[PDB]
Amino acid sequence: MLTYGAPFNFPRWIDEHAHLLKPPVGNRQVWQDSDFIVTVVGGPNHRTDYHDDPLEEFFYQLRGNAYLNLWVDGRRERADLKEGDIFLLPPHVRHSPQRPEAGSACLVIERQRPAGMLDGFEWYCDACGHLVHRVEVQLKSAVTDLPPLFESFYASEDKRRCPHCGQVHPGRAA
Ligand SMILES: N/C(C(=O)O)=C(\C=C\C=O)C(=O)O
Ligand SMILES: [Fe+2]
């Protein structure tokens, strides 16, 4: 049977969920309990964390524009996601998505992680670029598994202290 229901109009679905594609929620998973994690991410949202995903991520920027701060080959880089752009991110490429536009919408597709395949979330020093803090997580549920992790980093000057230059990371926003 059609466990995930029948086909449905995507632009209409996005419009109808527009109130959830803005702060404080910012995103919405389309189907529940599926192998493919299909999410629409709106805006505005900025962030300071870099994700280390052990699997690929697919992006299709449907509405508005966004960009990904990356680390590529030891250097800091930016991949722009202009409206209409698609992108496939390889495993383990550190990325920090920035979505400054209200009313933007990006289709993001990931896969469920098998037991033992962990995700990393990392912060880097604005002053010297050294890794400041990394947490590895078995990522089941995104909604419960991630906010406390981010909160506890922002709450602690110890966690936020660069081990190489002692500069304390701004936490939630530079
Ligand atoms: N599903 C999350 C994830 O990759 O952990 C991604 C969604 C990025 C949206 O811009 C992200 O934060 O990189
Ligand atoms: Fe530093």
Side-chain angles (χ1 to χ4, degrees), residues 1-74 76-125 127-174:
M1 160 60 172
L2 304 197
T3 314
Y4 302 121
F8 59 88
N9 186 271
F10 201 18
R12 188 172 335 264
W13 185 93
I14 293 167
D15 291 346
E16 290 173 1
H17 291 79
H19 57 284
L20 306 168
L21 303 177
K22 55 163 55 55
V25 186
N27 68 280
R28 177 68 156 186
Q29 198 167 315
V30 175
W31 295 282
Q32 297 292 319
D33 300 326
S34 57
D35 184 48
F36 286 11
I37 310 308
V38 178
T39 302
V40 180
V41 185
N45 194 57
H46 286 92
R47 60 202 285 189
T48 50
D49 74 281
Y50 290 78
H51 189 201
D52 171 10
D53 192 334
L55 300 168
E56 290 169 3
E57 295 189 13
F58 168 86
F59 298 80
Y60 183 12
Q61 190 71 38
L62 308 173
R63 289 182 195 185
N65 311 279
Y67 63 94
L68 307 176
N69 295 323
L70 308 173
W71 285 94
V72 181
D73 195 30
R76 313 191 86 158
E77 308 287 4
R78 187 191 62 244
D80 284 294
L81 294 174
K82 299 188 228 291
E83 195 179 287
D85 282 347
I86 60 175
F87 183 51
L88 185 64
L89 193 64
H92 302 297
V93 178
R94 314 304 205 262
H95 59 283
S96 182
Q98 307 309 321
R99 305 186 169 280
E101 295 183 18
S104 62
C106 189
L107 174 56
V108 179
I109 298 176
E110 299 180 23
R111 286 170 50 195
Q112 303 277 4
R113 271 65 128 178
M117 180 168 303
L118 314 181
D119 285 67
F121 294 85
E122 287 180 341
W123 289 264
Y124 286 82
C125 183
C128 67
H130 198 268
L131 179 65
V132 165
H133 189 72
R134 169 176 173 96
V135 184
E136 298 183 336
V137 57
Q138 179 75 57
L139 199 62
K140 175 195 71 175
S141 191
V143 198
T144 40
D145 294 349
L146 258 31
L149 189 163
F150 294 159
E151 287 169 31
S152 64
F153 175 77
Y154 301 155
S156 162
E157 288 186 342
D158 177 47
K159 276 170 197 303
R160 289 162 47 211
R161 175 176 298 104
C162 174
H164 170 282
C165 92
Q167 160 102 105
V168 177
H169 196 278
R172 183 182 291 266

mmCIF file of all heavy atoms in Angstrom, residues 125-130 132 162-167, ligand 2, unseen atoms left out:
data_model
loop_
_atom_site.group_PDB
_atom_site.id
_atom_site.type_symbol
_atom_site.label_atom_id
_atom_site.label_comp_id
_atom_site.label_asym_id
_atom_site.label_seq_id
_atom_site.Cartn_x
_atom_site.Cartn_y
_atom_site.Cartn_z
ATOM 1 N N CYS A 125 37.169 28.508 14.901
ATOM 2 C CA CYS A 125 37.524 29.831 15.463
ATOM 3 C C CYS A 125 37.575 30.911 14.380
ATOM 4 O O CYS A 125 38.325 30.791 13.413
ATOM 5 C CB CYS A 125 38.875 29.749 16.197
ATOM 6 S SG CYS A 125 39.405 31.327 17.032
ATOM 7 N N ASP A 126 36.754 31.946 14.533
ATOM 8 C CA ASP A 126 36.767 33.094 13.624
ATOM 9 C C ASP A 126 38.140 33.764 13.571
ATOM 10 O O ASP A 126 38.510 34.354 12.559
ATOM 11 C CB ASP A 126 35.709 34.118 14.041
ATOM 12 N N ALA A 127 38.905 33.651 14.654
ATOM 13 C CA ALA A 127 40.230 34.264 14.715
ATOM 14 C C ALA A 127 41.324 33.453 14.018
ATOM 15 O O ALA A 127 42.022 33.998 13.157
ATOM 16 C CB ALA A 127 40.623 34.570 16.175
ATOM 17 N N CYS A 128 41.485 32.177 14.374
ATOM 18 C CA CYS A 128 42.573 31.363 13.810
ATOM 19 C C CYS A 128 42.126 30.191 12.925
ATOM 20 O O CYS A 128 42.959 29.498 12.337
ATOM 21 C CB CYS A 128 43.484 30.837 14.918
ATOM 22 S SG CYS A 128 42.720 29.663 16.013
ATOM 23 N N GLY A 129 40.825 29.952 12.821
ATOM 24 C CA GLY A 129 40.353 28.871 11.972
ATOM 25 C C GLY A 129 40.520 27.475 12.555
ATOM 26 O O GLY A 129 40.130 26.502 11.927
ATOM 27 N N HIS A 130 41.070 27.355 13.763
ATOM 28 C CA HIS A 130 41.246 26.032 14.369
ATOM 29 C C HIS A 130 39.876 25.487 14.807
ATOM 30 O O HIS A 130 38.980 26.276 15.152
ATOM 31 C CB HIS A 130 42.182 26.151 15.586
ATOM 32 C CG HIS A 130 42.788 24.854 16.035
ATOM 33 N ND1 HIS A 130 42.209 24.055 17.002
ATOM 34 C CD2 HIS A 130 43.936 24.232 15.673
ATOM 35 C CE1 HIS A 130 42.966 22.988 17.200
ATOM 36 N NE2 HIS A 130 44.024 23.075 16.413
ATOM 37 N N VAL A 132 37.197 24.427 17.244
ATOM 38 C CA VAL A 132 36.925 24.821 18.624
ATOM 39 C C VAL A 132 36.200 23.709 19.411
ATOM 40 O O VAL A 132 36.500 23.430 20.581
ATOM 41 C CB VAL A 132 36.054 26.102 18.607
ATOM 42 C CG1 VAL A 132 35.432 26.393 19.932
ATOM 43 C CG2 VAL A 132 36.880 27.287 18.095
ATOM 44 N N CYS A 162 38.621 28.542 21.936
ATOM 45 C CA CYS A 162 39.587 27.970 20.997
ATOM 46 C C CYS A 162 40.824 27.481 21.756
ATOM 47 O O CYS A 162 41.407 28.231 22.551
ATOM 48 C CB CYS A 162 39.976 28.957 19.869
ATOM 49 S SG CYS A 162 41.314 28.396 18.739
ATOM 50 N N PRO A 163 41.216 26.219 21.528
ATOM 51 C CA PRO A 163 42.333 25.598 22.239
ATOM 52 C C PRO A 163 43.666 26.084 21.716
ATOM 53 O O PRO A 163 44.702 25.849 22.345
ATOM 54 C CB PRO A 163 42.173 24.113 21.896
ATOM 55 C CG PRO A 163 41.569 24.118 20.544
ATOM 56 C CD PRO A 163 40.637 25.302 20.529
ATOM 57 N N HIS A 164 43.641 26.744 20.565
ATOM 58 C CA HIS A 164 44.865 27.153 19.896
ATOM 59 C C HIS A 164 45.185 28.629 20.141
ATOM 60 O O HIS A 164 46.355 29.000 20.214
ATOM 61 C CB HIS A 164 44.776 26.853 18.394
ATOM 62 C CG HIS A 164 45.885 27.457 17.597
ATOM 63 N ND1 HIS A 164 45.911 28.795 17.261
ATOM 64 C CD2 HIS A 164 47.011 26.913 17.076
ATOM 65 C CE1 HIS A 164 47.004 29.049 16.564
ATOM 66 N NE2 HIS A 164 47.687 27.924 16.435
ATOM 67 N N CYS A 165 44.160 29.458 20.301
ATOM 68 C CA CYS A 165 44.369 30.898 20.412
ATOM 69 C C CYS A 165 43.576 31.527 21.568
ATOM 70 O O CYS A 165 43.625 32.744 21.785
ATOM 71 C CB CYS A 165 44.009 31.561 19.073
ATOM 72 S SG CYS A 165 42.304 32.145 18.923
ATOM 73 N N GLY A 166 42.843 30.696 22.301
ATOM 74 C CA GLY A 166 42.041 31.140 23.426
ATOM 75 C C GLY A 166 40.859 32.055 23.158
ATOM 76 O O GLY A 166 40.077 32.323 24.074
ATOM 77 N N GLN A 167 40.721 32.560 21.936
ATOM 78 C CA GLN A 167 39.548 33.358 21.572
ATOM 79 C C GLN A 167 38.290 32.530 21.852
ATOM 80 O O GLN A 167 38.233 31.339 21.513
ATOM 81 C CB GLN A 167 39.635 33.751 20.080
ATOM 82 C CG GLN A 167 38.335 34.159 19.392
ATOM 83 C CD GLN A 167 38.171 35.656 19.227
ATOM 84 O OE1 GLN A 167 38.326 36.190 18.125
ATOM 85 N NE2 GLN A 167 37.830 36.342 20.318
HETATM 86 FE FE FE B 2 41.437 30.417 17.586
#
